[PDB]
Amino acid sequence: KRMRVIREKVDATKQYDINEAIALLKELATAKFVESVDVAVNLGIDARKSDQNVRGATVLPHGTGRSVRVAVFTQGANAEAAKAAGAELVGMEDLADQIKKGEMNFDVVIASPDAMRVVGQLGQVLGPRGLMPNPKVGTVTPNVAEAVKNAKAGQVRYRNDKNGIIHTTIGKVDFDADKLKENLEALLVALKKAKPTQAKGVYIKKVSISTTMGAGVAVD
Amino acid sequence: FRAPESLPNPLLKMEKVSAGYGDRIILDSIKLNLVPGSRIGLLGRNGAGKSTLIKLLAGELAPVSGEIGLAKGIKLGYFAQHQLEYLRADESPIQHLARLAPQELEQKLRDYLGGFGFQGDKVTEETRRFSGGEKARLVLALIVWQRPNLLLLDQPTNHLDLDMRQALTEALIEFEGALVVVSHDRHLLRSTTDDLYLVHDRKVEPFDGDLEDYQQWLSDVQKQA
Amino acid sequence: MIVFSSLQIRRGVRVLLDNATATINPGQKVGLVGKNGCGKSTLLALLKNEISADGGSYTFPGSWQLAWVNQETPALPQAALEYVIDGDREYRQLEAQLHDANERNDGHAIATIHGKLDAIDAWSIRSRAASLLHGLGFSNEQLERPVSDFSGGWRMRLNLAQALICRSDLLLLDQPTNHLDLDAVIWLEKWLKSYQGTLILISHDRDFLDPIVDKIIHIEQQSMFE
Amino acid sequence: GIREKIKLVSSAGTGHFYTTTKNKRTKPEKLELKKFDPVVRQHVIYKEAK
RNA sequence: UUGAGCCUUGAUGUGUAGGAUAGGUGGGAGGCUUUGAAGUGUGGACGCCAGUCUGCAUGGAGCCGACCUUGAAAUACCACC
Numbered sequence: 092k093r094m095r096v097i098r099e100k101v102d103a104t105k106q107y108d109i110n111e112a113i114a115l116l117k118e119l120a121t122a123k124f125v126e127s128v129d130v131a132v133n134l135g136i137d138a139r140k141s142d143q144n145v146r147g148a149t150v151l152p153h154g155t156g157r158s159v160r161v162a163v164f165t166q167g168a169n170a171e172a173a174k175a176a177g178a179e180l181v182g183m184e185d186l187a188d189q190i191k192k193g194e195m196n197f198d199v200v201i202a203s204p205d206a207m208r209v210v211g212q213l214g215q216v217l218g219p220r221g222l223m224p225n226p227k228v229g230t231v232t233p234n235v236a237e238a239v240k241n242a243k244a245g246q247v248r249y250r251n252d253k254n255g256i257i258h259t260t261i262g263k264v265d266f267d268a269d270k271l272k273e274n275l276e277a278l279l280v281a282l283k284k285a286k287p288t289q290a291k292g293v294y295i296k297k298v299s300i301s302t303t304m305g306a307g308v309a310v311d
Numbered sequence: 312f313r314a315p316e317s318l319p320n321p322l323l324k325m326e327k328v329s330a331g332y333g334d335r336i337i338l339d340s341i342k343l344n345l346v347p348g349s350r351i352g353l354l355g356r357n358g359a360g361k362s363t364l365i366k367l368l369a370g371e372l373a374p375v376s377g378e379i380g381l382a383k384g385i386k387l388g389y390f391a392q393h394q395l396e397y398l399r400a401d402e403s404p405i406q407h408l409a410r411l412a413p414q415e416l417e418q419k420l421r422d423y424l425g426g427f428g429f430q431g432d433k434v435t436e437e438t439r440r441f442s443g444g445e446k447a448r449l450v451l452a453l454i455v456w457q458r459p460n461l462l463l464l465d466q467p468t469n470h471l472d473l474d475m476r477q478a479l480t481e482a483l484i485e486f487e488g489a490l491v492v493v494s495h496d497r498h499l500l501r502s503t504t505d506d507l508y509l510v511h512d513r514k515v516e517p518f519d520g521d522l523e524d525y526q527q528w529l530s531d532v533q534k535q536a
Numbered sequence: 537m538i539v540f541s542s543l544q545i546r547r548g549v550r551v552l553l554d555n556a557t558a559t560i561n562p563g564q565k566v567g568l569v570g571k572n573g574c575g576k577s578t579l580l581a582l583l584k585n586e587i588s589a590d591g592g593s594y595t596f597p598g599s600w601q602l603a604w605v606n607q608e609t610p611a612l613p614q615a616a617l618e619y620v621i622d623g624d625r626e627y628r629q630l631e632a633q634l635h636d637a638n639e640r641n642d643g644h645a646i647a648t649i650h651g652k653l654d655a656i657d658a659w660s661i662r663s664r665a666a667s668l669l670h671g672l673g674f675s676n677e678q679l680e681r682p683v684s685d686f687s688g689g690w691r692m693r694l695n696l697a698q699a700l701i702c703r704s705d706l707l708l709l710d711q712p713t714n715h716l717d718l719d720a721v722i723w724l725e726k727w728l729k730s731y732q733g734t735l736i737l738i739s740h741d742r743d744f745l746d747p748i749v750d751k752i753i754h755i756e757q758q759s760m761f762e
Numbered sequence: 763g764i765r766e767k768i769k770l771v772s773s774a775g776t777g778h779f780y781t782t783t784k785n786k787r788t789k790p791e792k793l794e795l796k797k798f799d800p801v802v803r804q805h806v807i808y809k810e811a812k
Numbered sequence: 813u814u815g816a817g818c819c820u821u822g823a824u825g826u827g828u829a830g831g832a833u834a835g836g837u838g839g840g841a842g843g844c845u846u847u848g849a850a851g852u853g854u855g856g857a858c859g860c861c862a863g864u865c866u867g868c869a870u871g872g873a874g875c876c877g878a879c880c881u882u883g884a885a886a887u888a889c890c891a892c893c
């Protein structure tokens with residue numbers, strides 16, 4: 092029914108407005124869920140070349156869609172600010188080796204510059220899943236407390252694909268249409284600042300707003 | 312190829328060969344002796360022991376069962392398949408053949424080498440410097456010199472040129488003594504070999520038919536999967 | 537789109553090409569034909585960027601990835617999987633720098649190199665190499681076996697699958713069917729006739745060369761005739 | 763006759779070379795001389811190239 | 813009749829140990845069946861012959877996430893592909 096009604100109700104030959112599209116998406120309301128909305132933007136980048144790696148972060152004030160417990164890992168006295176950060180994870184050099192085998196991870200990682208045990212133990216578990224520290228993204232930084240504070244505010248991350256695309260979260264369908272616009276624009280501005288150097292052509296070929304349980308449509 | 316004595320009528324004493332390479336067992340059965348003058352070609356797929364058998368007959372791979380035998384006056388000619396880097400790399404061809412003919416011969420012993428394509432100062436240096444083709448030609452030139460009577464060839468026409476192939480085939484057709492050669496090309500086996508044994512599974516058997524039957528026999532094995 | 541123009545490759549005292557020019561357009565499978573001790577492997581090394589052109593300017597597009605098969609495969613103790621994975625370069629180099637970073641304690645470099653590794657598939661490389669080696673025969677018990685023995689026609693499969701693990705743009709095959717059976721030659725030509733990138737081949741086999749070649753470069757008398 | 767013409771260029775990072783000849787079919791090697799560089803006014807190493 | 817390109821739709825694809833022919837990113841841990849469930853009768857096509865697979869009724873109204881071995885983790889579904 093979900094693939095039978097709204098599919099014949101929407102038409103893909105024409106674009107919609109940045110606000111009327113998301114309004115009709117709110118009207119869709121296919122699933123018996125909270126139907127958190129996400130975005131999918133196709134970038135123009137040569138994913139075959141390691142030079143044009145794209146990795147960044149944005150902050151969405153209105154709706155992140157969930158709460159993620161950041162796990163700050165500091166080696167030595169690096170936990171002085173971690174104890175006050177309030178992250179749902181516990182960091183420890185001794186608690187890292189057994190921690191990786193026992194528990195999977197938190198929603199984020201804490202970068203300890205002198206605590207090079209997360210890299211030595213994560214390996215397939217820490218990196219193959221998609222939760223490794225990112226010095227270029229901004230996961231590893233001397234201000235452990237500042238990173239812990241930033242992570243709890245909805246530090247939306249993203250990464251490319253084999254096709255150079257990006258998709259990530261913007262909020263829930265509960266949150267208002269104006270909130271969705273002022274989140275989309277913030278994410279787009281962060282992306283446009285994060286655009287690499289050897290990036291010829293148009294950097295946004297398509298942008299789409301999607302219901303994570305329903306059906307998505309191109310927005311711009 | 313020159314003329315050897317070709318005296319020994321029993322070429323080797325073969326019995327309960329059980330060639331294994333230590334960790335496993337490769338071959339245990341065996342076939343008719345080389346019976347001087349016979350020309351045999353070893354068919355068979357890859358990884359089936361066609362090279363283990365050649366090394367076992369050559370005398371560089373002691374069988375685990377033992378007593379593989381070899382006649383008193385056999386001059387062996389051995390041409391390894393992939394260990395073309397078995398000849399010493401640091402020695403030039405002239406002082407390579409010199410240690411094979413140590414006493415007598417002269418600085419005009421290089422007249423022999425010149426006729427084989429090493430016709431300059433190329434006799435005074437050898438390394439990976441030599442290309443694959445002349446590295447394969449040097450082994451043949453060193454095999455010919457000492458008048459072998461039993462030839463063992465593990466695909467001698469890998470890096471050889473087309474003219475090299477023609478010359479080698481013509482020489483082999485005129486060759487006198489016993490010859491064992493294994494290869495995939497039809498041209499060598501149509502003109503030189505006569506018997507065409509098969510190396511099957513863990514055993515070597517006389518086999519029936521020709522290469523036409525063998526190439527379909529190979530494709531009939533795939534019905535097992 | 538690769539051009540040799542007045543190449544003049546000399547090898548110590550000896551000169552292999554006096555002055556010879558040729559062109560190869562992109563997406564075109566080319567064969568190399570000569571003599572024994574002629575210069576075909578010398579040309580392949582020149583493209584491989586090791587030997588000196590001695591005034592040739594062989595320039596070819598620098599945005600290309602090259603997968604090559606050399607002529608001699610020595611005896612090595614490395615396992616089959618290690619030998620195959622070694623073919624996918626930019627991973628061994630990355631892990632070398634990562635080892636240096638780990639043993640020098642460069643926190644910035646650790647995260648940098650981990651990000652570079654995660655850019656490529658990385659952690660699934662063993663699975664990719666096993667999936668590739670499964671198509672060329674093999675079961676699973678030979679994966680940890682050393683390449684030292686591996687028959688003679690299976691070592692060829694080892695160092696021939698060492699090239700199909702990187703998805704290159706230029707494939708330099710030097711005598712690839714040296715020990716292969718008719719079982720594997722057919723598969724090799726089935727793959728090659730479907731290959732998309734630009735391929736340069738060296739072989740003396742007319743029967744193998746007939747199907748999957750477009751044009752021939754013949755190095756006859758210190759010159760290349762196309 | 764048979765002698766070619768080679769150009770040995772400074773290793774001191776400036777463009778200043780000495781042009782000379784060399785029999786390229788008798789002496790297989792690259793020239794590795796050392797000589798004056800008037801740009802930097804120091805005796806540096808000049809190696810053959812073209 | 814026959815090429816190339818573009819838009820859309822439906823199929824398409826292990827490994828190695830696995831319930832299983834586990835394509836990526838990762839949103840979710842549940843909607844899917846009810847314009848009427850799985851299974852059985854029955855073809856098609858693929859077939860790393862293990863297995864997917866979809867036209868028809870009949871039968872009629874259920875089974876997939878969970879926890880399992882892992883480099884990964886699910887065709888629960890849906891996005892951009």
Ligand SMILES: Nc1ncnc2c1ncn2[C@@H]1O[C@H](COP(=O)(O)OP(=O)(O)OP(=O)(O)O)[C@@H](O)[C@H]1O
Binds near residue numbers: 444
């Ligand atoms: N590493 C080397 N150092 C010095 N000279 C070399 C080297 N390799 C080859 N040569 C010289 O160049 C000649 C041709 O070598 P090359 O490997 O290019 O031949 P080729 O055309 O590939 O022949 P083949 O078909 O026999 O492999 C050799 O005969 C030798 O004189």
Ligand SMILES: Nc1ncnc2c1ncn2[C@@H]1O[C@H](COP(=O)(O)OP(=O)(O)OP(=O)(O)O)[C@@H](O)[C@H]1O
Binds near residue numbers: 356362685689715
């Ligand atoms: N040195 C060695 N140590 C252990 N096993 C070996 C050794 N050499 C060969 N084998 C094994 O023995 C078997 C046969 O090897 P061999 O080299 O004789 O093959 P072949 O049938 O003659 O084929 P090819 O054309 O590849 O040489 C294979 O299973 C191979 O792995």
Ligand code: NA
Binds near residue numbers: 362
């Ligand atoms: Na062999």
Ligand code: NA
Binds near residue numbers: 442577607
């Ligand atoms: Na060569």
